[PDB]
Amino acid sequence: NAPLIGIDIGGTGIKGGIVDLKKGKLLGERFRVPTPQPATPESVAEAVALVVAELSARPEAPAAGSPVGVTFPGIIQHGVVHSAANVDKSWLNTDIDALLTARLGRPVEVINDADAAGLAEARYGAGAGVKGTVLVITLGTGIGSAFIFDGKLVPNAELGHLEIDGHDAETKASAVARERDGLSWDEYSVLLQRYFSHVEFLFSPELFIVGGGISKRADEYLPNLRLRTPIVPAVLRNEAGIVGAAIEIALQH
Numbered sequence: 001n002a003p004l005i006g007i008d009i010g011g012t013g014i015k016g017g018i019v020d021l022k023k024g025k026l027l028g029e030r031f032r033v034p035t036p037q038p039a040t041p042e043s044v045a046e047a048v049a050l051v052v053a054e055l056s057a058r059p060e061a062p063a064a065g066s067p068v069g070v071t072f073p074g075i076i077q078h079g080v081v082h083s084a085a086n087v088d089k090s091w092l093n094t095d096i097d098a099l100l101t102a103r104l105g106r107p108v109e110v111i112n113d114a115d116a117a118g119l120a121e122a123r124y125g126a127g128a129g130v131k132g133t134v135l136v137i138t139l140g141t142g143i144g145s146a147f148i149f150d151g152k153l154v155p156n157a158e159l160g161h162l163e164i165d166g167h168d169a170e171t172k173a174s175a176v177a178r179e180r181d182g183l184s185w186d187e188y189s190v191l192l193q194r195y196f197s198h199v200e201f202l203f204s205p206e207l208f209i210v211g212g213g214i215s216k217r218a219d220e221y222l223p224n225l226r227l228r229t230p231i232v233p234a235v236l237r238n239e240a241g242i243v244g245a246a247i248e249i250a251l252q253h
């Protein structure tokens with residue numbers, strides 16, 4: 001049926017795509033603009049507007065007033081941001097749905113970035129057909145987590161902020177932390193063994209799906225892990241957030 005525009009707000013880039021929910025893929029190429037710095041509500045709103053404007057002008061674009069799905073790296077409750085771990089703190093308590101709807105001139109509904117990735121994996125990726133608890137852990141600027149149960153999203157799980165060995169988990173195990181501390185893939189594997197085995201004890205999941213940029217290098221560390229839970233890289237990576245954002249619109253509507 002009718003495609004929907006999905007927007008993924010990341011630390012280094014704000015990208016979007018026209019999503020065909022029938023195939024779980026994008027129509028045409030994804031479009032990206034640099035994440036403004038500082039990334040404030042006002043600057044980010046402008047960047048999102050540019051991405052949406054570009055996609056809306058394409059022949060394969062959905063109706064001009066169709067709702068747009070957008071991701072954000074934080075807790076989202078009733079369109080309001082409740083955490084801003086790696087973004088400007090001015091985002092806290094910001095009604096992002098209202099902010100973007102006003103700027104774009106069409107309905108906009110935001111969802112956590114990891115949650116969106118989870119919806120996508122559950123519907124079109126490594127989580128399809130898997131019942132029970134499925135945890136999608138994304139490794140990038142921060143550590144994101146989508147809690148899926150029986151194919152349904154249990155919203156806003158922030159497992160990247162579990163405390164492990166005296167530290168906020170992502171401060172030591174994010175993709176960024178790995179480079180900052182000069183860790184080899186094997187040393188990083190030690191940190192991940194600790195993280196996943198801990199989360200495994202916390203939830204006894206049926207499956208772990210690893211997302212985020214460096215999940216593309218999963219063969220460098222997953223083979224070293226010794227878990228009771230099967231663990232595989234995510235099917236969608238560069239487009240997981242975009243697709244998941246569109247899925248959320250559909251589910252809500």
Ligand SMILES: OC[C@H]1O[C@@H](O)[C@H](O)[C@@H](O)[C@@H]1O
Pocket residue numbers: 072073074075083085086112113114115138140141142143144145158160161170
């Ligand atoms: O972007 C990945 C994750 O980073 C964490 O620091 C944020 O708290 C999460 O909301 C986000 O999903």
